[PDB]
Coordinates of C-alpha atoms and ligand atoms in Angstrom, one line a residue:
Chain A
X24 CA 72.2 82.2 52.6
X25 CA 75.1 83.6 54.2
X26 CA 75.2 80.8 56.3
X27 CA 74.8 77.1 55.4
X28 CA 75.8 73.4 57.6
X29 CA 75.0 70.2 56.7
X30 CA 75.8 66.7 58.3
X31 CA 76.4 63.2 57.0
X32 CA 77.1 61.0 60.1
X33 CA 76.2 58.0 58.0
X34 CA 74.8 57.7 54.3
X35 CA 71.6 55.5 53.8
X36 CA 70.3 54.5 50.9
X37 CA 67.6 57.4 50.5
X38 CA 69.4 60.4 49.7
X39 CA 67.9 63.6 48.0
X40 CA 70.2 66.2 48.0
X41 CA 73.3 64.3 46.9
X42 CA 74.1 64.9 42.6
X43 CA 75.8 61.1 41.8
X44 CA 78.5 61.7 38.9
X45 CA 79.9 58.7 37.2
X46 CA 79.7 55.3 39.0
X47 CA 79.1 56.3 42.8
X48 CA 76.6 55.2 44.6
X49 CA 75.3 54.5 47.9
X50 CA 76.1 51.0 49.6
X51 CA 76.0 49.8 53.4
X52 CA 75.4 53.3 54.6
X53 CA 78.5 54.6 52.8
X54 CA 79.1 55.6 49.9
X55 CA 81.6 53.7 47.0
X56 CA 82.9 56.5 44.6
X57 CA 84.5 53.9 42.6
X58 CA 82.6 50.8 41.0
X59 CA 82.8 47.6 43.2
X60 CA 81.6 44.2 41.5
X61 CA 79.1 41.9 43.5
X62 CA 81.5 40.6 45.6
X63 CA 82.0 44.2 47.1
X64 CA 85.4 44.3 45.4
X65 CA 87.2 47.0 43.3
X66 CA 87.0 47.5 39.6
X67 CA 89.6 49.2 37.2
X68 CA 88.8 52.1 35.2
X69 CA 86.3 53.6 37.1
X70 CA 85.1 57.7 38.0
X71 CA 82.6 58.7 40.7
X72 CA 81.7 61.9 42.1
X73 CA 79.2 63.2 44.7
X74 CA 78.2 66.8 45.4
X75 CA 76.1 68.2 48.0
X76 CA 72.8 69.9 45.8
X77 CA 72.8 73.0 47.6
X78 CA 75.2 75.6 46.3
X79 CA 77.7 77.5 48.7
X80 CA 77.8 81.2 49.0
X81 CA 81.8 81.1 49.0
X82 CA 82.2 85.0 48.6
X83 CA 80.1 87.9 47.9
X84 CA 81.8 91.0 45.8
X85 CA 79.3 93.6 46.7
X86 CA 80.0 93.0 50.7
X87 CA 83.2 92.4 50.2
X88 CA 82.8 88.9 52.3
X89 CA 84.7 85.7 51.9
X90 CA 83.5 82.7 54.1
X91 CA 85.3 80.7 56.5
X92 CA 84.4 77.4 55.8
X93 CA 85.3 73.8 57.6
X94 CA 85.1 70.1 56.0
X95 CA 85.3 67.1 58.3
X96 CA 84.8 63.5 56.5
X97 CA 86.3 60.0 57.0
X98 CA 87.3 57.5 54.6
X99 CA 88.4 54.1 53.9
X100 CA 90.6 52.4 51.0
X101 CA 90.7 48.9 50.7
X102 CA 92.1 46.6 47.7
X103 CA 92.8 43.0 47.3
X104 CA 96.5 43.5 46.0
X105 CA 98.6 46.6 47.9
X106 CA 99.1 48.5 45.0
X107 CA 95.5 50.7 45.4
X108 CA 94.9 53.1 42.9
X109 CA 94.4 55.8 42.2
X110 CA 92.7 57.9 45.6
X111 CA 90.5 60.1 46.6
X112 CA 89.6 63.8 46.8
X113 CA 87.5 66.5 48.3
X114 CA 86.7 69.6 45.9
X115 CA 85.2 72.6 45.4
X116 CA 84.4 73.8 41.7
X117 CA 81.6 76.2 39.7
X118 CA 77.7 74.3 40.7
X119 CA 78.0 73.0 37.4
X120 CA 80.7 71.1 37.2
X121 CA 81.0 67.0 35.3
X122 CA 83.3 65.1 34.9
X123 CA 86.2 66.0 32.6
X124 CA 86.8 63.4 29.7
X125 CA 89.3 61.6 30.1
X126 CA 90.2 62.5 33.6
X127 CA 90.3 58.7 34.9
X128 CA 92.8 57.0 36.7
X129 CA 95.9 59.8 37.8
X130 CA 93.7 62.5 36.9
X131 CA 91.2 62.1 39.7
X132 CA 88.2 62.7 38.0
X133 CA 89.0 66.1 38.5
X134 CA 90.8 67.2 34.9
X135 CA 91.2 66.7 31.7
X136 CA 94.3 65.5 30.0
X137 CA 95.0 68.1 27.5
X138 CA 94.9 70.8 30.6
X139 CA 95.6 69.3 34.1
X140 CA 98.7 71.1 34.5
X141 CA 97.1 74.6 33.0
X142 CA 96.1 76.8 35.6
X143 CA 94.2 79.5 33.9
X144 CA 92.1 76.6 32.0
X145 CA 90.6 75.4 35.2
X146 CA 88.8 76.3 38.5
X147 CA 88.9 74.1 41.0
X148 CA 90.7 73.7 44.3
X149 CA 91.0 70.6 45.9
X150 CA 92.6 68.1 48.7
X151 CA 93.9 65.0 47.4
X152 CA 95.1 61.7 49.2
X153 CA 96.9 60.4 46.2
X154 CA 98.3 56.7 46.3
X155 CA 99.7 56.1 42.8
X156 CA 103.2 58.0 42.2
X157 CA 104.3 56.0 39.0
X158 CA 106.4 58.3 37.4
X159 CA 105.6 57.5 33.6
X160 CA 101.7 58.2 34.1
X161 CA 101.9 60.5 36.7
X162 CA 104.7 62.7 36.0
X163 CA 103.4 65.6 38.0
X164 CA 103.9 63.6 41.3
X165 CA 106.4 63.6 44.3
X166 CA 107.7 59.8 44.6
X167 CA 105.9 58.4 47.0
X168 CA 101.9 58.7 48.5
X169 CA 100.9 61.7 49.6
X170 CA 97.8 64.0 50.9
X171 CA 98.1 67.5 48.5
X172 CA 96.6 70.6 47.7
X173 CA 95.6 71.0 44.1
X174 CA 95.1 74.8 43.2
X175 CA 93.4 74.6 39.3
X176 CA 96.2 71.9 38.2
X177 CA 96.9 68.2 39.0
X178 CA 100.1 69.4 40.2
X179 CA 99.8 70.2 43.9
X180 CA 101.0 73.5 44.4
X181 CA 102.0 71.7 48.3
X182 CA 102.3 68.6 49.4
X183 CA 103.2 65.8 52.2
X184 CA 104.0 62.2 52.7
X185 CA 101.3 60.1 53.5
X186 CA 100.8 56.4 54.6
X187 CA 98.2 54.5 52.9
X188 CA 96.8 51.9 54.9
X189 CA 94.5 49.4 53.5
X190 CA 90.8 49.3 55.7
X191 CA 91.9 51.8 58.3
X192 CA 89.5 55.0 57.9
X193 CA 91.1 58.0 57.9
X194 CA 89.8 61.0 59.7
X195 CA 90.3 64.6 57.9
X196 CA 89.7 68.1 58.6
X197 CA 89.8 71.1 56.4
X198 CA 89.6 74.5 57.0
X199 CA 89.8 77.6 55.1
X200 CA 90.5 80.7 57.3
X201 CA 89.5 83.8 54.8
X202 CA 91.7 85.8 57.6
X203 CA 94.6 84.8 56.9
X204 CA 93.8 83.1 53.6
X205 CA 94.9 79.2 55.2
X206 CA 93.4 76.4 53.9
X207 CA 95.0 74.0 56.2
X208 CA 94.3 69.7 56.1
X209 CA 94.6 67.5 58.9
X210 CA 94.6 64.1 58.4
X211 CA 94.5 61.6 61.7
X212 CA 94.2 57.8 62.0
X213 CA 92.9 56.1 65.3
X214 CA 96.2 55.3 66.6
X215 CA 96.6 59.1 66.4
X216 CA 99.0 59.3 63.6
X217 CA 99.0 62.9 62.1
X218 CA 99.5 64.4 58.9
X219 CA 99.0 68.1 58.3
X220 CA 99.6 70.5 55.1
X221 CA 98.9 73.5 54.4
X222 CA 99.1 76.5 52.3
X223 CA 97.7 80.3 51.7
X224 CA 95.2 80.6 48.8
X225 CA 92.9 83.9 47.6
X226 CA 90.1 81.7 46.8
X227 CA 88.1 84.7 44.7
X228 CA 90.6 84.9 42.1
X229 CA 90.3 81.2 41.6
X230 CA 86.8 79.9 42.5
X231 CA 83.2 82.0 41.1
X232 CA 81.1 83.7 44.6
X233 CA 78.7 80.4 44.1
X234 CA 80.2 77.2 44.3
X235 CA 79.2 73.3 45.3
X236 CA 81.4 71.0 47.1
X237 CA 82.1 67.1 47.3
X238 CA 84.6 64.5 46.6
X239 CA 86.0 62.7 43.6
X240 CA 87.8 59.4 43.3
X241 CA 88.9 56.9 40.7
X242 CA 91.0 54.3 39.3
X243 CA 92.7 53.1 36.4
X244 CA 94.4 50.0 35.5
X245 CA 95.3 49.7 39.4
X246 CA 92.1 50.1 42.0
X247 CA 91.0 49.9 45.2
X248 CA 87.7 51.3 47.0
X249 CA 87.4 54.7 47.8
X250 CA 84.5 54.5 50.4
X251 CA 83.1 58.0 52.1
X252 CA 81.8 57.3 55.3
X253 CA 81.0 60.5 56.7
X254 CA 81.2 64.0 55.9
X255 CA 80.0 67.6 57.9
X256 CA 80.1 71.2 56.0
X257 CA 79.9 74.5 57.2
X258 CA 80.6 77.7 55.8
X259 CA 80.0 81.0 57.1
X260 CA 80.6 84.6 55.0
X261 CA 82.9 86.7 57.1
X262 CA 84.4 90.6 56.7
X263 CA 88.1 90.6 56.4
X264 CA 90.5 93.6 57.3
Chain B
X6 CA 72.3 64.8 55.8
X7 CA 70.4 64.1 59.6
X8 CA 71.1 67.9 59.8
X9 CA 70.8 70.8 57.7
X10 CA 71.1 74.7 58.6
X11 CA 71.1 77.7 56.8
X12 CA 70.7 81.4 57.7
X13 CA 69.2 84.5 55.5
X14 CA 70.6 87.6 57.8
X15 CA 69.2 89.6 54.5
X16 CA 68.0 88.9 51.2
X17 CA 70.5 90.0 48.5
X18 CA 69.1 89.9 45.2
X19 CA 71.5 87.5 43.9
X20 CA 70.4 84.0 45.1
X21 CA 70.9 80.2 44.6
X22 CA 69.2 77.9 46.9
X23 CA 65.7 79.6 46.8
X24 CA 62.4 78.2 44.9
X25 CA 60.5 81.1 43.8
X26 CA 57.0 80.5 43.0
X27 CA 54.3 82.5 41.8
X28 CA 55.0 86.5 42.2
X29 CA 57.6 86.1 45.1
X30 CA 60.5 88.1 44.0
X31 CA 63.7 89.8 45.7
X32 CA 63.5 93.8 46.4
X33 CA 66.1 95.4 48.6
X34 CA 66.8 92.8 50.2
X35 CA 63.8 91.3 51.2
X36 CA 61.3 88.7 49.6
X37 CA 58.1 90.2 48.6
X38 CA 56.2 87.4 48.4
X39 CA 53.1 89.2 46.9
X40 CA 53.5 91.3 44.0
X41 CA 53.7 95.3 44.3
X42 CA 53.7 97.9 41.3
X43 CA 56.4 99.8 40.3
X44 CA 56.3 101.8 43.2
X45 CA 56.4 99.3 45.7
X46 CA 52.8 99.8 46.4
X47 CA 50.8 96.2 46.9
X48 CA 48.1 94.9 44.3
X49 CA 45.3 92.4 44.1
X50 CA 45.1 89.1 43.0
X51 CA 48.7 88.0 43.9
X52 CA 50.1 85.0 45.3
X53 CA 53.9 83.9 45.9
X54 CA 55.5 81.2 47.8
X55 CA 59.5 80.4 48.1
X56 CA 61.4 77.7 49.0
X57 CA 64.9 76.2 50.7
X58 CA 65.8 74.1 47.6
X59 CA 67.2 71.3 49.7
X60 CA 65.1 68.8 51.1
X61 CA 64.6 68.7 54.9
X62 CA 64.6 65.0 56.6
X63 CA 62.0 65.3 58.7
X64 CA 62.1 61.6 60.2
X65 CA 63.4 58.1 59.6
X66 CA 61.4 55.5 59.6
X67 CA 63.9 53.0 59.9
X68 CA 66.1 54.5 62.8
X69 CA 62.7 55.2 64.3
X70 CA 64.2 59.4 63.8
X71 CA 62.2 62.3 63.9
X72 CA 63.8 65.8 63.7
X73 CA 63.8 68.9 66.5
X74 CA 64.5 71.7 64.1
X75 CA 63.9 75.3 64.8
X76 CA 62.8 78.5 62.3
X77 CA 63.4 82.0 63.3
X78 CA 61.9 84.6 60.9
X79 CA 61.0 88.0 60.4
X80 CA 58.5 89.7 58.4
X81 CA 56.5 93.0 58.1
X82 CA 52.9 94.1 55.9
X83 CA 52.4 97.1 54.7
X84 CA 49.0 98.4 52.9
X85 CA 47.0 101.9 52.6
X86 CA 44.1 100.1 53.3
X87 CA 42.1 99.6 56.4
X88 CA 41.9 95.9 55.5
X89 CA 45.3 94.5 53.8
X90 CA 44.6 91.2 53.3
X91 CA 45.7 87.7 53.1
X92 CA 48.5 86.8 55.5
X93 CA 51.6 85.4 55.0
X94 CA 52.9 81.6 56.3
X95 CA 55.9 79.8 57.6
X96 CA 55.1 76.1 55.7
X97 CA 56.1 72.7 55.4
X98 CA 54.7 70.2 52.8
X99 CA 56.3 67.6 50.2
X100 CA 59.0 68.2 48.0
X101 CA 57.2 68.6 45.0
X102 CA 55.0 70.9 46.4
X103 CA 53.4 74.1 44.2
X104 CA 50.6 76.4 44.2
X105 CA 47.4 74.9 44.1
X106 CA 44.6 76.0 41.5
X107 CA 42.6 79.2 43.1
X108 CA 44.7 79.0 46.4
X109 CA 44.4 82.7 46.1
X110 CA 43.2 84.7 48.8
X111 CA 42.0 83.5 51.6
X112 CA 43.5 80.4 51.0
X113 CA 46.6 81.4 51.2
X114 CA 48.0 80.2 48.6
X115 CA 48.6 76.5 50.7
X116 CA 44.8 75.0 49.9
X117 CA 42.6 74.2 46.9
X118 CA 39.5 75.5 47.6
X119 CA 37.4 71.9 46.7
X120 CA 39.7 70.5 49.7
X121 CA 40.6 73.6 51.9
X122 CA 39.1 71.9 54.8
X123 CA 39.6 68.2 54.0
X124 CA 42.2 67.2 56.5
X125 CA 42.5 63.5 54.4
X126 CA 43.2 65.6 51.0
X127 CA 46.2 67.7 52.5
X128 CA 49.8 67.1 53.7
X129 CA 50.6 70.4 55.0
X130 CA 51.6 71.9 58.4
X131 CA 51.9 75.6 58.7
X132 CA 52.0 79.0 60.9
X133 CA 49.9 81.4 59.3
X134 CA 49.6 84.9 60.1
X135 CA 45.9 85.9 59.1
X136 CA 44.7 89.7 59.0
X137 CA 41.8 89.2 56.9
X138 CA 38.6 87.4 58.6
X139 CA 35.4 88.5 57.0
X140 CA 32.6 86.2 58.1
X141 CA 30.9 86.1 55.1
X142 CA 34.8 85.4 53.1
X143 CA 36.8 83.2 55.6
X144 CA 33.9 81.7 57.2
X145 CA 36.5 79.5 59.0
X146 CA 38.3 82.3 60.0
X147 CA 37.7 83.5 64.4
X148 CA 36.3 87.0 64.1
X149 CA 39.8 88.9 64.6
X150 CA 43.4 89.1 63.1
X151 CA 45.0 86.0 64.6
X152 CA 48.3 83.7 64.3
X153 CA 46.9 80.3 63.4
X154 CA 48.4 76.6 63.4
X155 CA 47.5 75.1 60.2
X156 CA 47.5 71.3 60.1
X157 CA 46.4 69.9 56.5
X158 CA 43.2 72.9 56.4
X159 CA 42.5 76.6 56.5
X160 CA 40.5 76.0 59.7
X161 CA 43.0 76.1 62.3
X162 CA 43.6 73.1 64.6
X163 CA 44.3 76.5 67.1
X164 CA 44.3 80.4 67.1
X165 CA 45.6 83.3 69.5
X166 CA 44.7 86.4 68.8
X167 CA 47.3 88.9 67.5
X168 CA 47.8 92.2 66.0
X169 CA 48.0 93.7 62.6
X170 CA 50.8 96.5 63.2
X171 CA 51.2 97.9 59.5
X172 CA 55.2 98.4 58.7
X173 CA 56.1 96.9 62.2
X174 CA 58.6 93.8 61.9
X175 CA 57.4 90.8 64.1
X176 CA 60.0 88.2 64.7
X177 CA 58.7 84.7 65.0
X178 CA 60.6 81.9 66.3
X179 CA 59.0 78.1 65.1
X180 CA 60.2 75.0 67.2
X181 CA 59.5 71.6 66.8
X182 CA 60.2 69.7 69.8
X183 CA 60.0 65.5 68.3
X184 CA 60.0 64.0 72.5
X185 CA 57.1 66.3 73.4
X186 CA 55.6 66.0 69.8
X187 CA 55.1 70.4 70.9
X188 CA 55.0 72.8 67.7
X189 CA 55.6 75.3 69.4
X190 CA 55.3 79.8 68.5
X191 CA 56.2 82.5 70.3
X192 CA 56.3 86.2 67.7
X193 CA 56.9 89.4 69.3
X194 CA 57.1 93.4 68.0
X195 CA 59.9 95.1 68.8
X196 CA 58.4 97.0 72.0
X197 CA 58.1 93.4 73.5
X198 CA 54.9 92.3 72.9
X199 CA 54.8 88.8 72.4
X200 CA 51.9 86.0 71.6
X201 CA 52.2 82.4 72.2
X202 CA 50.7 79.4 70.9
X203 CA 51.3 76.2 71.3
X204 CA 50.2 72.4 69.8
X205 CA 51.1 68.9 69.9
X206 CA 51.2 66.6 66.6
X207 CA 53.2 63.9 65.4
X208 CA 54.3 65.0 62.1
X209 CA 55.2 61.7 61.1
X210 CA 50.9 61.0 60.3
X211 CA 51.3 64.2 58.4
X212 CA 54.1 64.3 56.3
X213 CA 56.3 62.1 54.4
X214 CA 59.9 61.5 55.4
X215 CA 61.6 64.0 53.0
X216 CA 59.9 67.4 53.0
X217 CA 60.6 70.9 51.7
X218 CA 60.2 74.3 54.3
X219 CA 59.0 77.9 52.9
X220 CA 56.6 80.8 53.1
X221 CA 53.6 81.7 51.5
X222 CA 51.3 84.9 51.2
X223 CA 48.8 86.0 49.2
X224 CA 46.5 88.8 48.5
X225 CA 42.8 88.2 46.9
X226 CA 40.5 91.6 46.5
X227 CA 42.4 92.8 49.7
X228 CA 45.9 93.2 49.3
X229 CA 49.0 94.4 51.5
X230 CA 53.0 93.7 51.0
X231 CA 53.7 90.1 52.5
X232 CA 57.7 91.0 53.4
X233 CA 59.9 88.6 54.4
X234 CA 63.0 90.1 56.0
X235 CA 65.1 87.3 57.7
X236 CA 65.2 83.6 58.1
X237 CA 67.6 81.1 59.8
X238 CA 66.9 77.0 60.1
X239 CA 68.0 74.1 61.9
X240 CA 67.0 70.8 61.8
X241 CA 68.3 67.7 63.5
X242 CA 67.2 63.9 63.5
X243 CA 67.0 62.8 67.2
X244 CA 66.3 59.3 68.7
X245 CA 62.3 59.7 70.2
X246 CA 62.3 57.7 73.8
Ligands
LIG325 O1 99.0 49.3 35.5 C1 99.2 50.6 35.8 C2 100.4 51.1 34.9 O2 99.9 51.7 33.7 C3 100.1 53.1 33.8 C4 100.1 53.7 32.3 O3 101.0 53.0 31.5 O4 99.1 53.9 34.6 C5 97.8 53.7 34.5 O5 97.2 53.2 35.7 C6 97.4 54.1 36.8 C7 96.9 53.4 38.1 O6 95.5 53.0 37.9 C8 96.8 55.5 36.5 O7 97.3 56.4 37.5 C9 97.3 56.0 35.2 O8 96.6 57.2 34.9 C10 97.1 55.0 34.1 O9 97.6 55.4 32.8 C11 101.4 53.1 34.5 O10 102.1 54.2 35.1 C12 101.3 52.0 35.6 O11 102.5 51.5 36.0
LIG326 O1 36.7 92.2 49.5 C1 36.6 90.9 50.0 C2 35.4 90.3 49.3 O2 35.6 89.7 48.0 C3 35.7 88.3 48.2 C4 35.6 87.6 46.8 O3 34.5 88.1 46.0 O4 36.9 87.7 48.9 C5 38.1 87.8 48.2 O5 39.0 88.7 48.9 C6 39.3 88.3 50.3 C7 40.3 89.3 50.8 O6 41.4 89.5 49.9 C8 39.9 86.9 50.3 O7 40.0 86.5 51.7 C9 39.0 85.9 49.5 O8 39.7 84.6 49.5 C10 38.8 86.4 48.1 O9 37.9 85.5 47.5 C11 34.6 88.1 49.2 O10 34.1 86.9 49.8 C12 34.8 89.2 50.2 O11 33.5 89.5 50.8
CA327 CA1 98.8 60.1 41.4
CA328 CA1 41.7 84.6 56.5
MN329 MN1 99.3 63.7 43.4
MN330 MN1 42.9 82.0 59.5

């Protein structure tokens, strides 16, 4: 299709066109990327993903096409201690994409050790909200938390502070404008503090004309809860000058 | 997701989210749902049924949900005969569904023909478009072409009748209206004329909560080119007062 939408105002328990990668799963009508005990708390060393089962038409080469595509989702991160790790992302990779060993803790789920800083070993681009900065384990990151854009390498490629705030849901928005080749992020809480990044991406030269999108979280020997608790999609192919 | 859309302006050749069954296949463009020779040309003995690969939530049991959704489709037949036969037909039926043994024909391609006209043995809801109605074939069949609202049989709960216009695109537009409980169809020809018919049913005795949506056509000792052209979707859960 050259058009596709889909809305998650809520998650219940009966889902069937979610794929569940690693430990997330569905709880209280959201749903925990990361592992959580009985007691609803965080675990270490954890990986989850979710991606929606349809695939997204995000160019076509004959038409000459590139779709304009919008993400809107909400979530919350909450930990016993104040040191949560290590956050959460939204992604867009080839339909099949799994988890990358050893891409736990730092790595988001997202790469593998031996090539998260290699950009022509990976395809993915992605929006992370990154609370662990410790410069031993994560070398690759600015001092402090921070929302970025990952373009094929767990180095983002752009960046801005960020405040995390433990049980406050945060409310994002990300658009891709094939136009003028902007993906731009907009992240609000209630009390209307704003954060916004952006930057200008060709996404054919990095992503294949199919793809499937979702989010990935984890942590490592420092947690916290990375709970989803909404998400809307829509992407729509569009000619470009 | 308590709503889904997707559109099909045109049906390129390369494609990810359809369930092809049987003989239905991509040709410039379109689906042909039956198969045709080398030449294009229609044969007998065909059948062919596609389907959106994502599941449709059709209601909610819990929130007391049923969905209003909305399919707008185009088609065209084609055959050298006086009499191309079966039809072609805008379904909806469980995920799992497939073609049923010696659904050919008149059938379809949506019935068995043991329980064709057992309402109790079938969870099915569909629009068909019927040009073949031999009385001594279709005995269930009114004695002209007709658009027909199929609701778990081959009889129709209701028929209008219509007319075969060979290489003329109709566009259809289905709407499921869950306060009313009104399926409603209204298909028109390009020089305006239109046909209307109309029921009320509570698909939530009919189907189960997650369902998949598609078309089917077939093509028994009669046969014509079943075409489908376009197709756009919406569905939305909505509280029923
Ligand atoms: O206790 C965390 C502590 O260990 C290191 C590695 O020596 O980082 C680990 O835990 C982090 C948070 O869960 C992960 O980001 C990292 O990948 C993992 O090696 C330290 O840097 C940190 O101080
Ligand atoms: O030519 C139609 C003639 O053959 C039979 C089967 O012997 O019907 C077949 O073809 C029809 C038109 O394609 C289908 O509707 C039917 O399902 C299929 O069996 C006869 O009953 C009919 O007289
Ligand atoms: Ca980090
Ligand atoms: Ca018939
Ligand atoms: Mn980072
Ligand atoms: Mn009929």
């Amino acid at each position: 299709q050259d058009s596709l939408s889909f809305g998650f105002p809520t998650f219940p328990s009966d889902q069937k066109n979610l794929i569940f990668q690693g430990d997330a799963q569905i709880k209280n009508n959201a749903v925990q990327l990361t592992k959580t005990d009985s007691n609803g708390n965080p675990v270490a060393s954890t990986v989850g993903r979710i991606l929606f089962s349809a695939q997204v038409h995000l160019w076509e080469k004959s038409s000459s096409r590139v779709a304009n595509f919008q993400s809107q989702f909400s979530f919350s991160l909450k930990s016993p201690l104040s040191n949560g790790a290590d956050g959460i992302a939204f992604f867009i990779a080839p339909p099949d994409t799994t988890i990358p060993s050893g891409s736990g803790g730092g790595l988001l789920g997202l790469f593998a050790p031996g090539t998260a800083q290699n950009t022509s070993a990976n395809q993915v681009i992605a929006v992370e909200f990154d609370t662990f900065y410790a410069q031993d384990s994560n070398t690759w990151d600015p001092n402090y938390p921070h929302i970025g854009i990952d373009v094929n390498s767990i180095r983002s490629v752009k960046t801005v502070k960020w405040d995390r705030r433990d049980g406050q849901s945060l409310n994002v928005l990300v658009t891709f404008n094939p136009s003028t080749r902007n993906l731009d992020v907009v992240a609000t809480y209630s009390d209307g503090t704003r954060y916004e990044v952006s930057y200008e991406v060709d996404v054919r030269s990095v992503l294949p004309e199919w793809v499937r999108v979702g989010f990935s979280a984890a942590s490592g020997e420092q947690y916290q809860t990375h709970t989803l608790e909404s998400w809307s999609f829509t992407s729509t192919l569009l000619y470009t000058a």
